[PDB]
Design a protein around this ligand. Sequence first.
Ligand SMILES: *[C@@H]1O[C@H](CO)[C@@H](O)[C@H](O)[C@H]1NC(C)=O
Lengths: 242, 146, 305
Amino acid sequence: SSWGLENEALIVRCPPVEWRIFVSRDRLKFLPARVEDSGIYACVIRKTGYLNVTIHKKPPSCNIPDYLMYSTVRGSDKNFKITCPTIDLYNWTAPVQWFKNCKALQEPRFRAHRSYLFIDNVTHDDEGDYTCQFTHAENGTNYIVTATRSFTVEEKGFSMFPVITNPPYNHTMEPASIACSACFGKGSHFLADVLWQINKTVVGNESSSNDMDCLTSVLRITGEYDCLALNLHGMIRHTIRL
Amino acid sequence: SLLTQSPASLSTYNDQSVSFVLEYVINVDDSGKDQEQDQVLLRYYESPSPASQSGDGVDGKKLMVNMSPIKDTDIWLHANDKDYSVELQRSPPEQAFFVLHKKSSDFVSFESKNLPGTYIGVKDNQLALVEEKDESSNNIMFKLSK
Amino acid sequence: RCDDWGLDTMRQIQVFEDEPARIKCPLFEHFLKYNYSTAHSSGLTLIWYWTRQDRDLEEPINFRLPENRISKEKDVLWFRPTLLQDTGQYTCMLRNTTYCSKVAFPLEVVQKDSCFNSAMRFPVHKMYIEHGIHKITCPNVDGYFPSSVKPSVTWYKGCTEIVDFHNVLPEGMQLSFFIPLVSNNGQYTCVVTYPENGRLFHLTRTVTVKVVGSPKDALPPQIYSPNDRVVYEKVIPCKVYFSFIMDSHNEVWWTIDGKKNESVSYSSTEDETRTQILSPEDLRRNYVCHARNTKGEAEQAAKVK
Ligand SMILES: *[C@@H]1O[C@H](CO)[C@@H](O)[C@H](O)[C@H]1NC(C)=O
């Protein structure tokens, strides 16, 4: 599927190529795009593919509906950058113009660089639907292009290389119980696990003065022992013997 | 020596989606909002690389991943030794393992274990093996979301 | 004869070879009640002498070099440009028929590489990670050319020229980091080229950019050990994590019912992990580890049974 607004340029990619509407190398171009040509187009390589293109009438209201927006950007206070979708198919030049809820972003707070928009001092109040607009130049004629995606801002929290609090590095303990605890920072974690390894393979309530996010796996064998902590930063092992 | 498995969707630094197409090839492009994107199963192991600055005295190591589509779990992201491409291929070899670097709060990098110094990066809406360079570091940065 | 204030400093002022350099007579802010304007109004003058590095006598500073290579302006002595021979001990002296005063200080001219490798000592510039857009500025450029002259500025990371990075952009005298990461660490050099009286001049400055943990992740001290799940059944280490904070004095200490080996490890973003290891009736005692930073104070007792 592909979509675009009418009287705007539209250029599409299909997965020795054969297909007002032009074609250059392997790409199909609408300059300008008009609602009549919205259909299903076929591409051949000498082996084929199709996509359904839809051309739309410029939205009546400023709030654009969901079906002409691109994938949502789940941003944070640590990733306040929005990319302009599809822009590298066109022959475009800086600067790209940005809008939020149909209003021009003109500030030092909103910085445009290559295909990106950076929001300084980002806050939850900067959530909403952003429209990039740029120009595609072809044979002296400039055709305009816009794309829209929505953008949210969650307050992240940080992460660190895991730290095992117990058991200690070089220990030995004499119905048996040993707890493996680690802390990973404070925040939201994509992956964070603590586990026990018996002979280097996986086996198969009160806390310290820490604000950090800590996990504990208690190994109890009711009758080399490795304590492992891992996240995307890496994995650390403390080995215990008895 | 498998540690953990976890499904996740892969996006690019430039907010584009990576997809696996039926009759399998890799694709990198933007998608419509609320269009369900493909997922991949990541298997995490202990790599031989030092956790670069795990701290003074701590013998940290980085993790090592291999990736599968959730639709079929015996297909692997495989790095070509002399063709420098990332392709899906059908007990995986060292060509399907990638050392995982955490590069920012939201993006990671996959250095090919089979060919040290080269990472998975997006090239012409595909996956290729490239080098990390400051001007174009965004090539090799990927976001893992659940 | 004169009264000698000794040598103002034992730190060499380092200036690059074959680049203009203005060095200031320290006499006005480090040793006297005066400032230059008041003194010049009081009818006395500032004269200069020096001893070149490889000599053992003092010579008057020669103001008759071709193209006024070395000239004096107000409380400053100007090199246009600097030459390698000028490494030496300089002396500025204020005098009239009634009053004198003089001080000396060392100047070192430094050779640089094509990759800007030199004995120069750069400043370190710390940048909050992933905390808004940050800008650094080419340092020590004021006073070298008037505002009507717009110079050419080029930035390099290491040896490589920066046109722009995906998260770095140069704008004249400033370099912008849109979302600072560890990956942006390194030596950033600005080169400033400007004309003056028909000559072309260059000024090079290198800044070490280091990314440090942001204030938003700043926490009070976190004590990993001791914790309840370790017991000392009869050496106890206190392991405290400190978020990076710019002008903060991190403290970890032990108390044995209220009184009396230190080591520290640094993160990539320069968060600190401090371990202070300490070691009859001694097993009755209550051993408590303390820590403090700008964001708070922590306490944890070790269990000694
Ligand atoms: C885009 O390519 C055309 C040739 O088709 C060229 O004339 C034009 O300068 C390029 N774009 C811009 C805005 O420079």
